[PDB]
Amino acid sequence: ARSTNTFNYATYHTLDEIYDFMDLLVAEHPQLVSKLQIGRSYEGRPIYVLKFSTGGSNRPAIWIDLGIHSREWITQATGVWFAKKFTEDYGQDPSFTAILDSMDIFLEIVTNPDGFAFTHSQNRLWRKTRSVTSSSLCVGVDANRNWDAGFGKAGASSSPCSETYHGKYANSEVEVKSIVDFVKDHGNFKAFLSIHSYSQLLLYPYGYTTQSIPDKTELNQVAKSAVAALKSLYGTSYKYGSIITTIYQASGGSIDWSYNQGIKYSFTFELRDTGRYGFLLPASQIIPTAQETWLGVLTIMEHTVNN
């Protein structure tokens, strides 16, 4: 509340609390972190990214997004913990220090603010954005099906009332298009990570086509290693593989888009648990979840800095 050291990380927060947290963090570490507004949501809420940097101009960067699906509260909660962690570990953790000294990290805690607000205000289990239209009384698009990657292919719904509705056209949702333009304009992203929940999976592309990516052996080995690191803390077991072989066909996904943009290290994490609580994971699981995912992510960043 008054300081990031006083913020309660072991609990779930509303949108305004998370946005206040960002300003506080910026205030305390003006030299490391900045807040950028890359757009406004459908209902007009600002869309913010925190930039963590030790300088340089256009350094190679790491993108991380959380909360694209609003009801996955463990993701926004993990995001706020990561933001604090970066500031704590810079200069104490040799590894993470080496990463920040040469690369920038861009963190989008609440990718879908309108749906997050709605999860607190009206329906805890809403997952889509809140865009509306004409030929339907139904609202919203599944933002992870709106990217320009096999857009409209099998693995998405064409019905507006579906929970997996892909939208009118690729990039129709402003929350997605804001990310697209920002990443394209930067052009120096080397890693793209999207965090969702639940199922305990670490996936790589693709989900829209059975075709194998050419970087399959390396991605798989990085995935393996990351999973091994994650499990190391609490023994949480993840499986890993390409989206389509692992889950099922799904089109218009984030990481398929990023990888096709030339961003090699593109992975999606599906956090705890495996179904016992599902979207409604207990607040007592926030910290342990965050701590173990951090080891997973750090592992991918380390490989990135190195390759």
Curated annotation (Swiss-Prot):
Q: Keyword annotations for this protein?
A: Carboxypeptidase, Disulfide bond, Hydrolase, Metal-binding, Metalloprotease, Protease, Secreted, Signal, Zinc, Zymogen
Record comment: activity regulation? Inhibited by interaction with the S.magnifica carboxypeptidase inhibitor SmCI.
Can you state which reaction this protein catalyses?
Release of a C-terminal amino acid, but little or no action with -Asp, -Glu, -Arg, -Lys or -Pro; leukotriene C4 + H2O = leukotriene F4 + glycine
Q: Which residues bind substrate?
A: 69-72, 127, 144-145, 197-198, 248
Quaternary assembly: Monomer. May form a complex with proelastase 2.
Residues reported in the UniProt entry to bind Zn(2+): 69, 72, 196
Disulfide pattern = 138-161
Which superkingdom? Answer: Eukaryota
Name this protein carries in UniProt: Carboxypeptidase A1
* Enzyme Commission number(s) of this protein: 3.4.17.1
Q: What are the BP-aspect GO terms?
A: leukotriene metabolic process; proteolysis
The subcellular location is: Secreted
* Main location group: secreted
Q: Name the gene.
A: CPA1
State the active site. Answer: 270 (proton donor/acceptor)
* Domain (Peptidase M14): residue spans on this chain: 11-304
CC terms in the record's Gene Ontology section: extracellular space
**Cofactor annotation comment:** Binds 1 zinc ion per subunit.
Similarity field: Belongs to the peptidase M14 family.
Asked if Nucleus is a keyword of the record, the answer is: no
Q: What class of enzyme is it?
A: hydrolase
GO molecular function annotations of the record: metallocarboxypeptidase activity; zinc ion binding
Q: What does this protein do?
A: Carboxypeptidase that catalyzes the release of a C-terminal amino acid, but has little or no action with -Asp, -Glu, -Arg, -Lys or -Pro. Catalyzes the conversion of leukotriene C4 to leukotriene F4 via the hydrolysis of an amide bond.
CC cofactor:
Zn(2+)
Name the tissues where it is expressed.
Pancreas.
